[PDB]
Structures are given as structure tokens and as C-alpha cells.
Write a protein that binds this ligand. Sequence first.
Ligand SMILES: [Mn+2]
Ligand SMILES: [Zn+2]
Ligand SMILES: [Zn+2]
Ligand SMILES: [Zn+2]
Lengths: 146, 65, 188, 84, 164, 114, 263, 773, 133, 36
Amino acid sequence: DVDPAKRIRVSHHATTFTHCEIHPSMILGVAASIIPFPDHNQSPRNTYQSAMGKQAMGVFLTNYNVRMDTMANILYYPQKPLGTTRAMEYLKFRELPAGQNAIVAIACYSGYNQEDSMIMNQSSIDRGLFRSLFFRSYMDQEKKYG
Amino acid sequence: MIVPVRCFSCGKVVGDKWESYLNLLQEDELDEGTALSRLGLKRYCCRRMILTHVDLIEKFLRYNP
Amino acid sequence: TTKIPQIGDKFASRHGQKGTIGITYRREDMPFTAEGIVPDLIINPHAIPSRMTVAHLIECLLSKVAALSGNEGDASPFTDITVEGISKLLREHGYQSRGFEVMYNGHTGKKLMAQIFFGPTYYQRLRHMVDDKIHARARGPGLRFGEMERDCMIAHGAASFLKERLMEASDAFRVHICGICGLMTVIA
Amino acid sequence: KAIPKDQRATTPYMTKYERARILGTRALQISMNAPVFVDLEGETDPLRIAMKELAEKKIPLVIRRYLPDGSFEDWSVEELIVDL
Amino acid sequence: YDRKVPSPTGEYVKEPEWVLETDGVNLSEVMTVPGIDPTRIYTNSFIDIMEVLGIEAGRAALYKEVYNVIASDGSYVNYRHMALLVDVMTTQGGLTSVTRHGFNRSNTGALMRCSFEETVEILFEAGASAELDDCRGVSENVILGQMAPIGTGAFDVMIDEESL
Amino acid sequence: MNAPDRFELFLLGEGESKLKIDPDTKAPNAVVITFEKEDHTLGNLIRAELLNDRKVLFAAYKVEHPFFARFKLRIQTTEGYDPKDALKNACNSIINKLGALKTNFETEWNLQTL
Amino acid sequence: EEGPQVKIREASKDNVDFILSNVDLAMANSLRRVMIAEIPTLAIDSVEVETNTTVLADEFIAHRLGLIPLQSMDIEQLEYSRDCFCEDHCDKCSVVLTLQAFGESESTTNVYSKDLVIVSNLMGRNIGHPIIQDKEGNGVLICKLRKGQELKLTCVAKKGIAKEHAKWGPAAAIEFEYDPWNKLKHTDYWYEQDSAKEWPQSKNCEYEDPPNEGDPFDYKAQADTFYMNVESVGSIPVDQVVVRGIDTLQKKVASILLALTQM
Amino acid sequence: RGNLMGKRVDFSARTVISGDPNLELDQVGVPKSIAKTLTYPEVVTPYNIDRLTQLVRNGPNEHPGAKYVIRDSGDRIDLRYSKRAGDIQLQYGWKVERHIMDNDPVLFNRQPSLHKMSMMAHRVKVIPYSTFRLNLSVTSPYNADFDGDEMNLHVPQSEETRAELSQLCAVPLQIVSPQSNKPCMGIVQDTLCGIRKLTLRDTFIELDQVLNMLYWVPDWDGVIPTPAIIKPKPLWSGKQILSVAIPNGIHLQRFDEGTTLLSPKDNGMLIIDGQIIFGVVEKKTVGSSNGGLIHVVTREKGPQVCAKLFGNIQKVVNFWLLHNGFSTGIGDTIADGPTMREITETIAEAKKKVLDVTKEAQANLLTAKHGMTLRESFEDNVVRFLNEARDKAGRLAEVNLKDLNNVKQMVMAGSKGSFINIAQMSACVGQQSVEGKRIAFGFVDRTLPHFSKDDYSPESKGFVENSYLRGLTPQEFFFHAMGGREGLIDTAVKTAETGYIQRRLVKALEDIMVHYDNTTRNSLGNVIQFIYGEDGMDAAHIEKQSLDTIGGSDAAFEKRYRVDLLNTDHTLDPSLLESGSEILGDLKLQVLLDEEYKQLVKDRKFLREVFVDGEANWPLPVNIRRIIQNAQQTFHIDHTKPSDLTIKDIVLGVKDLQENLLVLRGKNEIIQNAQRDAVTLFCCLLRSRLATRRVLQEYRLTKQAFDWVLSNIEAQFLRSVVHPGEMVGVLAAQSIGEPATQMTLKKVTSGVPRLKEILNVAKNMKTPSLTVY
Amino acid sequence: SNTLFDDIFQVSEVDPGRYNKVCRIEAASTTQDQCKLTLDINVELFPVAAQDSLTVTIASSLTRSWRPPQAGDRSLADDYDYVMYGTAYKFEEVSKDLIAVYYSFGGLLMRLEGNYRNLNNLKQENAYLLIRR
Amino acid sequence: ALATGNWGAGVSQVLNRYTYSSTLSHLRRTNTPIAK
Ligand SMILES: [Mn+2]
Ligand SMILES: [Zn+2]
Ligand SMILES: [Zn+2]
Ligand SMILES: [Zn+2]
């Protein structure tokens, strides 16, 4: 009488309860809250991701054009991920995203995508897929006591 | 920033359907799926283009200079 | 500066596995679906078994259904969403419930004997791009050659290479030496 | 301290290291317009020519193999058997 | 433990035997206990094996230990490599470690890679003891602008007044 | 920077010809043609048609490396039959084939309402 | 007319659902590829910027400009600037357009392709007119202007092909199928319990006869009967995408017979 | 000292790497932009005046160009700035600094390089886009992938230096490595997955696609092989075309579990004269395995042919895979509805066994195992139960999956995959653990505030019941993360510790070399080994061979080797030998045959003392079985007619050969003994392989094939002796350290911690144990 | 110019073992109870079932590359339906008193078991396999 | 001190701004100077 597709959970043998979790997914921090279905991944892979999300390109701020900082990378056409998270709402990910929804094919095609490399569609690149702006700004002054 | 001109995958013109899509939602109170199909976006590659866009320009325009 | 995706640039999904563009193909050459849908990106299945990254697969399934129905896919941890659940919804849309689709080779038009897991997945463009690390230092008139590199050349027994590569600029000076005392006290 | 042509107990066979150095020495010479000792049935690349000279045993070189104690043996490239 | 043994007909057969594994070591004293096979007693402490059975037995054990550390991961390494390591650690009669014993040397030359910003001292002592540099290393020969007597340079080449 | 211009995919550079015909040695009546600035579009085509010819003993093509736009075509034919001709034949045979298709289409187009 | 045979199902200004029959799969494909990559078209391929106080970057805007489909009906009556004997661009090989926009109202001012203006001489050939298909004759949304911001550009349309850049592509997608009933057995269906029950039956299964239970595998059947559908993007009439597809393919082979000739 | 640390790295470049199925094993794709930066000084000579004159005209900006022209006087003319850049007349003896071009030998390297095979020499292939390109099979020796790895390319600067690289470091000369006396390069990933799908019996190829495949193999000879099926359809076998990539003269035999000469399961492998006769081609045949196809092709055809072999195979399979396709999806991780039920019950059965032992312990009925605590042995049984569960749960999922299952297809081929993976994805994930135990009571008497105190159940202490497919509960998630962190922490350790151990080993052995006397010594001149490896052999020339004399019952030993010319029953039947009949009752010959048998019996005794275990397969030089399989194919030896070999031919022949297998040559008594010792083990293999009955009864060699076998064995043997000048010490250090940089994870001390404990000669071991019999 | 074996068999079993186009048949021989046969067959191009009756002829004639048509109008040495062509990696088992031989058809295996074939079959590759009705 | 990270360290750092989530992340990060 139980959904065989669901995961196996334990039973409520308690009459002692003094508190209840608002929601278990809140044990996660900011970076991990962005991983979709983190509970279906091997543990170390979640950690790897949390590191890389910090190396992604997005729209760090909407006022990027007015700030004059050392380096900046802005994606041309940011998209909100088709697969979101509930925590993702308080993180403004849909508002200031990073990355796009690529149509992905898992396949052995010409052989040019082995040992962790990828075959990207050149036509999609022409139409704007993954283009980004890059800004670098140089500074400099004048003398000191002389 | 703004509606990409075309669907990255197939080429379909999509940069001429952003406002319509927006209306189909507000003034017609339709849902995104039904809205998208009425604009002719039948294959998911084209559907995701519009359904996933984020119009950050409408926030850029809010800065004075 | 505008940066356009090139061979060597890094990309990654949200499941701890990056990759670089090995080559780019134009639409004609890409493999295709009956509806004429073509992939923006092709990754290798050999990178699936060992990583134990099932979520990537489920995010794909979920994302397909979301695009086909204009609904935001919920990939939140600790909920009751299932692959069976998602497979049912995708089926209702007329697709084979586990994400597979029949595809045809772009050079031929002929079908593939195997079907392909096809669907949208969220990918992130990472920083540190090819043209930034291409450094090539050749002065005639990493990237170093240190102790470990030398031990390798020793093992190969490549002595003159070690001599050629380790010798500095200093001029080859000619001196005379006594055969009795090994000193440079010879008046020539 | 030299050992007579008889009594040499070292290998009759040329070592891969000797082959590598001889070919390299000879090639260097050919690269500097030194006289060649074979018919260049079309060859132009020095090392490639050197390899040809070796096969036809026409390299007038001698290898001095030293022993850990100081003594040594002398083997002509001509003598050395080339099988590697 | 199961044990491959020759049966009376000749073919090897498994013959299980009781074995004792301990926590702590006292080879000399247990080796002498009645009821055991002193001929086969063993211990992963190759240092005690050396002190009780001698250096040759010490060597054998040290190889068995190194070898296990490599078989534990299913990995394989040809015998000679581990053997060479084990002989070097054993050549002088005792177990000489490899994880850097000397602050100056192991087998070098008062010329090779100037270690410690005070190479001066390495040279001062070499002088005071009349250290003799063999000149077989790579760096010493680099300092001398020559090729090391190794591999491709472990012999000289000369012109031959024979070739007709 | 290292990327070649895109027009180099369909424009013959200097010193290059659309075809380089070379005699195959491994076998008799065999030729190897190199098509510069062409890909699978023509390759698999001329190959397929060439295969409909019975006096043709061999026909296969291949683009050795996706980086460059050129493919190689090897044809082997019956003694007396020149490979160069089978090609001309396969070509014309193709050209005709298309002309008909072109018509039939423009014909069916008209009979449609919209 | 003996040979390849078209049999149209649907037809409109955008799609051309049809059925190719009596042809080699190779030809169906080459034609399929040509439509996607080698049909000439006009498209903005150079933008000179006088003034951009917009919120976007020049190259950003310029990139979109090139993606704006332009009238390419009489594209053949136009030459490739690389062949043309002028110095750069001229009316014989290019169409010049202008875009001037100013944020006048306080409400956000939109800039569309309709706001593009041809400035060169089209000499009577239908070419360069920005395509418009929306229900309000606006066209593609190029940019958005706040009050006070400005945009003064100068474009230059030129003839090109998809192989060079996907902007010059007249095709949007190209459905392609054959042997909907897996009779040639070109594919091997993946399944959990039932091949048939798990795989959605396609449109074209109706236009064909399901194989019979006991028939032994037909080992001599080849691949004919291809179900295609061409979607045009507007720069050219659908019917044309196909037709010229066959045309270019035709000229290609022709350029080869002429190679053996003058060889 | 600042220069004795390799800093001013001139003539080298670095960049991201990409794989390339269209490059030959020994090539390296060099982007044009990097090619124009690195130069090679080439002296002007009449053999190259034109090419140079032409390069100098192209200049520093076009690829086949040059950067400087140097004249007699050592003057440097800068082609980029110089009013005469386009007006130069080269002269013999001058030097032109040209760009590196196709085929120059360059040194390619990936750090950390703790392997000689991590610094090999490649042939240049100038290509467009940036980034260096590598053949996929050169990937493991470099321990490289393409998720961002960067490599260095160094350009040899002299002529002797060019020669050194191409004659010693070139990739082909490294296929078979000495670290493990086997190839270090094999067919991988896509090509491996594809080669299996291509070799199945069900795989057939039609004419149209066969001609393309053939044409793809560059060493093809325009000869269309006749179809395995001519009937209503000319159809070729998948095995047929692959066979075209394999050269002639290649033979290979191997039997798996239940392989017969009719191997129903298409098991094993049987290649004859470069035509695979039976068996699916996977990792055991085409991988970097010991006696595999690559080991063979190398030894038999030579390094260059083998290098070409990787490419030919890659080109065919990759082509056949591009048009066949392969993929993987969520579907492949889903197990049968009933299977999942068999899995849930299997785990439920585990939770009962655990519940019982608990009640047992709580009543105080559990008895502690000697030298163990109640709690210690309690935990022990619980963990054994819980792993038994994960495991049996995993097997139920493995068995289920069909042969269509992509995950299973990858596992069957050898390319990425393993039981544990399928087990955690499809069935139970298993028990988590930190420091060898179940999750500890971090809070007082409990693992999380969500449980009650003193709860030792499996859900409490860390058993993850769900598969990754099903998803983990929050508690399961946290526990799996506790266990996960452990691996991340010590992966950092293992990393750091191994890098320092590797540099200490190298330092300790760096000076040890093999001298011309075959002695192994250090810089002082001290003797370490009186003969390298105690056998004088080079490890890259050694193969695992079976010493038969040592195995089985004595009856078997005698049936096999015993020849009694004086006994109607135990003689050589006159059909195996030409002079068979007139040999019966020959006293003088029987004396020869008894010498041979007494020697075979001694050998058996001897071997049984050395390998007290009973182990028969040991790495030795010269693969006799292969030499014989060659002879039998080369001389088309018919197993029907009697041989023309004499008993004196064999016995005296094999006896003579032994006096020729030379490792040492010294003419004195000591050396001659050393020589007899070094060749002892090999000679035991020899005498058992060339025993008279064997030669006539089993092999059937004729006098011609036999004489051929003897000379080959001598040739190969001599070709296996180690060359004086071998830097055996560095070779040794690296051969031990490299793999120690691959160890990651019954109660003792292993892995790096123990290794460091050994090399340190620590008097205070962590696990001092004694084993008494 | 030749032929080497002839007879008709009684298919006692047709096993497909996890394959979808191939089956391993083991048919006994009409006449001599000795003669037996085990063979791999591409069922997709010539189905087979138990108790069927196949006529098996070996032969070796009517290596140079192969041509497709023309001959289809000429040397129709095919008076049969199924027609393979393998090599003899034949292990004359010389079992007991009978003599079995092995053929390889691109991987599709075959093995006959008799005794009077000592002057019938080859000991070399070349050899076609024919079957009719 | 606020410019360096000198208290008694690395206590103060330049705020990440590569991505928005990377900024949120940096602002909620923890450090432990120097049994398990
Ligand atoms: Mn990597
Ligand atoms: Zn689309
Ligand atoms: Zn003096
Ligand atoms: Zn013009």
C-alpha cells in the first residue's frame, strides 16, 4: 500500500517530541541550496559543485555598469534554471542567475568528447549561447613626497 | 538582458514574441504553457528560450545615467 | 571585451563535474531528433557510472517536462517528487518516459542504432579561459623544468638533453690545469 | 687502463644508449656539411642519413666503454651488432 | 588460514592450519616457546627480525612489507624495483632509512644543488676532510659544463682509424 | 586568435583546386580524389550514387579531420571503365535526379491552398 | 515525372510538411543539410555606431542586429561583396540601413526592426526589408530606451550563408523521419518490459502499413519515403527554402563536372 | 642555485589539452600560434637551402616561417624588423631559426611528472585553434583528462638532442613499460565501448558501410575481404572488419571461465594470422592487459607498427560508433519492479538479524570473542550484517539489468564502471562510517537530536537504506556527508604525503646505474646488486609465464615428460616421429632420454623449494608459447604426419641452446657460475617447454620449425638483457612512488601511512604484530 | 572446381542465447548415427526450427577482392539459399575414434564430428558453407 | 586592521563578486585558525 517509487523512511515512534524542523533542507548553506536534487548525489560531488558555483558567470549586480572594479564577467543572456529549488527563492537566483538551459545530449558521437571534454553546437554559439562580457579596469596615480 | 533574437538551438525568431507572451499572461490570465503554445513555440528548445528569459534590462533602465 | 565560447573553455552542470569544449560542430553535422531538434551540447556517457551523479540525470528528465509544460521544475531535496512521477508526466506529453529519443546521424540522415538520453540541463560557463593560459615562452637571444622533470630525463638516460637544458648562459671559458695539483695555477 | 681486443667480456651488442649517441653525433656532423659516406637514395634529413650510414656499417666511430674500476674496452661501431 | 601443500600424490592441496596473530611484539622470547614452529614465525616489525634473525632475514622481511603495501591496493610492481630499494636500505649491514637521514648528503657532491643558503659550510667541511667528488651526478657536471656519465653519456666516443 | 576564418570552409584558398586526382597503387583501376572545400554533403552523395553503378568495384569517402574542409573519395572500376568517368556519370546521374525532384515539388506546391 | 516524388501534406507561409519518395536516403539528407547551411541570404554584417547611451554594449546590440531576418527574395540579383569589383560595399553588393532612436517619452521607449530604414538603392529588387510577422507590425525588439538615452547606428546588409554564420540561415528546423514502423530495423529499441508499449507511435505510422506478425525480416528493403517538414524563418518563402535547396545542391555537383572538364 | 632549480624555461609552451581521435598515438597537435613562437636553429645546408630560403621569406608571421637568420660571424638578423627581411641570401653554414614544423620531435609533459612516461617525445602536427591535442590512448601514462588540465611542450635545441628524444623517449618506445612488465597504454573509453558492440555475433555490416570502414584504415590494401555471409545478402561480420586493423602474423589465445573451441558465450579470444576467429573484443584483449593484443603486436612487429595499431583500431571503431551511437540515462539505473521488492526484503531481513543481536546483547546473552569487547564484537556483527545486505542487494540489481542496459554495456567492455557503483545507484547505498566505525554519538548518547538516547539501530548509527535513485532522507544525507568529508580530508593528506615520499625515494636511488659488467652500483662504486634484478634482465622484456614442471600430480608429470624407448607402452608412438619404429629398444638413445628426465625431476624439486607456495606463473623473458604458436603457423605444420626430428635433434639441441643464453661473458670460474645462476629459472622453463615428448606429441615441430624456434629464443633472450647505462635507481624509485600516488580508502596499517612508517625505519610501529605457526 | 561434404540433418535444437539474429543449431545426421553438427546461423536471413531437415554441403569453389553483381547473372554456383564462408581453425580433435573439425564464419562457428572425412575436408581457411530448404 | 586582516590572521578579505550567490556565500563564511 506504499508508493514503491518513494524513498524508504523511518517511523514516528514518539510521544516525547518537543520541537519540529521547519524544513530539513535548511541544513544547507547558500551554495549547496543551488544544487538540484542534492539528495540524489554522492556526497563529495555536492562539495565540488559548491566550489564551482563560485566560478560561474552571471550578473553579480544589476548596477555593474556603474561600478569600476578590477574584473567582471556578465553573461549575455542569463536564464533561470528550469529545475529550481525552494531555497533558491530567497537567494534571488531566478532574478540574478548564472548559466543557461542547454539542450544536452548524452552520447558517444564523433569521439571528440572523451575524458571529460564536450562537443558544443557552433550554430548555437553564433546565435548567442554562452557569450559573456568581460571587463578589466586599470588604475594609476601621480607622485608622492618629492 | 533582453529577449534573445532567436532560439539558440533551431534559429526560430523569438525576439518578436516577448511582449505578446507578457500580455498573454497578464491581460488574458493564461498559463505559461498554454501561452507559449499559442505563440507557436511548439518544440521545447524554443519554449525554454522564452519561459526561461530574465528581462534584467527593465532594471538597468532604472539607473539615471 | 566579449568572450565567445571556444575550444578549451570550461563548462559545468551543478553536479560537480566540469569539462572543456573539445570541438564545436555546426547544426548540419549534429545528430538530430524527428522534430528536427538538435543538441547545443553533447557530453559523454562514460562520465556517468563512476561519478554516481544520478541527480544530473533526474534534473534532465525534470527539466524536459518543465519546458514542455511551462511549469517550473522542483528539484528541491527531501520532497516527494519521483522519477516515476516525472516519467509519467513526460509520457503524457508523448515522449518515451525515461528521456530517450530516436536520433539520426547528421552526416547521413540514417538513424542511430541506439536511442539517446536527450533533454535540457542547466550549465554554467566558468572563468579562466584558454587564451588566458596559452603562455608560450621562447627566448633565443607551471611550464618550468624542475627536479621531477629532470629525474624523468635521467631515467630515460637522455644525458645531453639534460646538459643542454640545464646549462646557463655563462661563457665557456678555457683554463689550464696542473696534472699534479688540480689547480688553475698554470702560466700559459 | 685499456683491455686487449681479446679478453673483452663486455656485450658484443650495441646498447640503445650508444645507438642514440652515435646517431646524434653523426647527425650533428651531417647537419654541418661534413662529408657523407653513403649514397643518399633521396635522403635529406641528417639523422635519417646517419641511420643509413649505421645500417651500412659505414660510421668510422669507436665506443670507449669504461668499467667501474677505471679500466675500459674499445668497440668499433663496425664490430657492434645492432639488434634492438 | 588455508595453505597450499603438496599432497602424497603430488598435486597441491589446501590444508587449513590454526595461526596466532598478536598485538605487541617480542620475537626472541615467543620464538622460543614450546609447541610452535620457530621456523615459520613472523612479524611485520622488520627491525626485530633483523636483530634476531640477521640482516639477510631483515632484508627479506623489508621486501615482504613493502610488497604488501603495494599489493593492498591490487597494484603491481616488478620485483626488481622493490628489490633495488630493499638492497640499498640494507647494503651497510643495518636498516638505513630513506626518508632523509642526513642534513648533508645521502650520495651527492659538494657541488650538486647548493642546499641551505650556507653551501659555504658544505664546502668548508669537504675541504677539512678532503672529500673526493666522483663527478657522476647531473648538477655537478652541469656546473662543469659537461654531460653526466649516465645513460647516453656513460661512455666516450672516438674517431676510428680503421674504416677503409 | 588561432581560429581560422569561417569563409575558409567554402572558399578555396590560394594554390588549391577543387579536385586533386591521384592514382591508387594498392589496386588496379583505382583513383583517390581530394575535394577541397566540401564536406559530407557531397561526399556521402557522390558515394551513394557511385554505388548504384554496377561496373563500379569500390567507392568510399571520409573527412580525415573535422578541422579541415576536404574529403577523400576513392573509386575502383572494371577494366576499361575509367574511374574519372564513373564520377562524371554519378554526377550527371545525380544532377538529373534532382532536376526531376525540383519539378515534382514546384508542381505539388501549386496544387496547395495557402 | 519518374524519380524523386514530392507529396505535400500541409503548406503555409511558414511550414511545408511533405513526403519525399523514390530516393536515396543520402539525397534526402544532403538536401536536408543544404537547406540548413548553404542557401544564400542577406543579413546585417557590419555596424558603425555613432551614439549608444543605451544600457547595452555596442557589440551586444550589433550581434542582435545581425540576427534580424531581412528580405532575401531576390538575393540572387545581389552579389557577394568579395566578388564585387568595388572597394568595400556598394549598391551592387550591399544594402545600407539606419537606426536612430531617442528616449523621448518618460515611459520606456522600445526599438524594433521596423524602425530600421534603408538608405541605399534597392534598384527594384525586393531585398533588405526587415521581415515582420507579429500581429502588430513591430518586428524584433532590438533595444529599450529610458528617457534621455540614444541610439544612432549604421548597418550594412551583405549576402551570406549559414556555414559562415547561423544568422544567414533561412531554415529554422527540419523534421525528418523514415520507416516510422521500425521495419528496416535501423534502430534497436531500448525497453524495460515492452518495446511497443513504452515507445510513442509517431505521426507517420498512419501513412504506412504495420508489418505482419509472421513475416520474415525483409532483408532487401532499402530506405525510400522520407517524411520532412521545413520551417522558414521569413527571409525567404518556405517553398523557396526547399526549391533553392535542390538548386544549390545541383550547382554544387555542377561545379565539380566543370572541374574535371577544365582539369 | 636559482638556475639549478629550472626557472628560465626557454623554448617551451603550456596550454589546455583536448583529446583527438584523428591524431596518431605519437603525435601532438600544436596550435599554429604556439608553433610560430618556438624555434629550432637549423644550419643551412644544400639538403635544405630551398626549404629554408622559403621559410625565411614567409617570415615570423606566416607559419612555415622563421624568426632569425644568423650568419658566420654570429650576427643575428631579426626577420620582424629589418629592411632586408625579404632580401636575404642564405649561405651554407649559416643558421636559420625556423618555426617548429610537422614532425619535429618535441618533449611533451604533464605535471606532477613522477613517471618517465609522463615526459615522452612526440611528433609535431601544427593545427588551427589554441590548445594541444592528444590521442586518447596516451592519456593514462600522463594521468591526464580534459576538464582543464594543462601540459608543457619543450623543444629540443640541438641535433644530438633531437636524436636522444626520438630514439629514447618517443611514445612508441614506451608502450611496454618496466614498472610492471606490461603495456602502460591501451584502448579506452569510447573505443573500448565501441569495440565490444562491434564484435558481438549479432553485429553485421552491409557493403556500403564496409567499404567506408575499410577505407578508413590507412594501411589497407584495397582488397575487399569476402563476406562471412554470401547468401541472399552479402553481409560482413563486425569481427571481420576489425580484423583488417590487425596486421599479419599476429596470433593470440586465451580461455575464460567456460571457453571451448566453440565458446558458446563467444567467450575467450582466438586470433590467427591477424584474423579474429572467435570471442568478443573487450578490455582483456585490447586493454593494457598483460598478454593482450598490444603486448603481442609490440613484441612481434615492433614499436612503430604497434603505435600505428592504436590509430587504425581507433579510426574503424570510432567510425562504427559514430553511426551506431551509445548513450545512458535514468532508465539504466531503474531495477525491475519485482527486483526492487526482492531488494527491500533483503534489507528488511538484515534489519531483523541486527534487531535480534541487539535483544541478545540487551539480555546479556552475547559472548565476547577472545581479545574483544561485548560492544566491540556487537558492532562487528552488526556491520557484517549491514554490508552483507548492501552487497546481496547489489547483486540482485546487477543480475536484473539486461544486456541493453547501457550501464551494464560499459561495465562489460571495461570502460568506467563497477559493481559498487551500480549497487549504490540502483539498490542500497550502504553503511556510512568515520574512522572505521558507525556514526558516533556526537550529542550525548545519540547521533542527532532527532533520535532517542541509546539507540544503536541501523537507521540511527548511519545505515543508508536508499539508493541514489530513490534519494536519501535528511538523516541519511547528513551521515553520508560525514563519511564523505572523511574521504575529502585524507585525500588531501594521501596527496601531500605521497608527494614527499616519492621525492625521498628518488633521492635515495638517483645514482644507481647498471655498469658494463652487469653490476648495479652507486656513485661511489659500491656494489648493490652483483647483477641487476638478480637475473640481468630488463623489466620491459619480461612476461608472466607458467612453469609447468611444478604443477599437478606426479602421474601427470610422468605421463607428460616420460619417454621410455625400452617399453612398448611408454615410448614415442611411431606416428609422432618418422624414425619412430626403429627407435624402440634403443639403449644408447635411452641414456640420453634418462638424462633429460632426471633433469626434469630435479627441476621440479628445485622449483617446489623456490615457490613453496606452488605458484607456477612468474614473469620471465622470452615468451616460448608464443614463439611456438608462430612456428606452427609459419611452417604450416600439419598435425597429421609424423615429424622428421631425431631424439638427438631435440635433446642435444635444447642442451646446446642453454650454453648460449648469455647474461655474463667473463672467462673465469666465478662469472661462469654467476652466469649459470642468473639463467637457472629460465632454463627450467626452457627444459619443460622443449622436452622431447612435448616437442613431438604436443607441438609436432618438424626439424625446420624446431631449428627456427631455438634461434628465435636465443635472439629474443639476448634482446632482453638490460643495457649498461640504465638509470635503474630512478627507474626504481618512480616505479614505486608513482602507484603509491593512487592508493585511496582487516585491522592493521597499510597505504601511505604504513609505507612512510617503513621507509622511516620507525622503531615505534603503530601495529606491531606477530604471526605464529 | 570442387566439393567436400554432403548430407542432410535433423535439427534437434535451435538455441538463440541472448542474441537477436543468431542461433546455435545442433542437428543430427540422417543415415550415419555418428555424423553430428553444431552451427551458428543468422536466423534473420534464414530462419530455422526444431525437427527441420537441412541439407549441408561444404565445397570450396564456384584471394582477390570480390565483386558484387555481374556474376549474379553468371557463375550461379548457388543452388542453395544460406551461404556462408569461413576459415578452418580446425582442431582435428582426433577424439576417441572419430574426427571432428572446426570452421569460423566471421565469428559464426561450426563443428562437424565423424571419421570418413580424413580425405574429405581441408586443413586450410577457404571453404564455403551451403544449405537449402 | 580592516584593510589588512591584522588583529592579533586573514580576518578581512576582498568581497567576492563573481556571481551573486558567491557574494552571499562569502558573507556567511567561517574560519577556524589552527582534536578533529
Ligand atoms: Mn583533470
Ligand atoms: Zn528552438
Ligand atoms: Zn701544480
Ligand atoms: Zn560592391
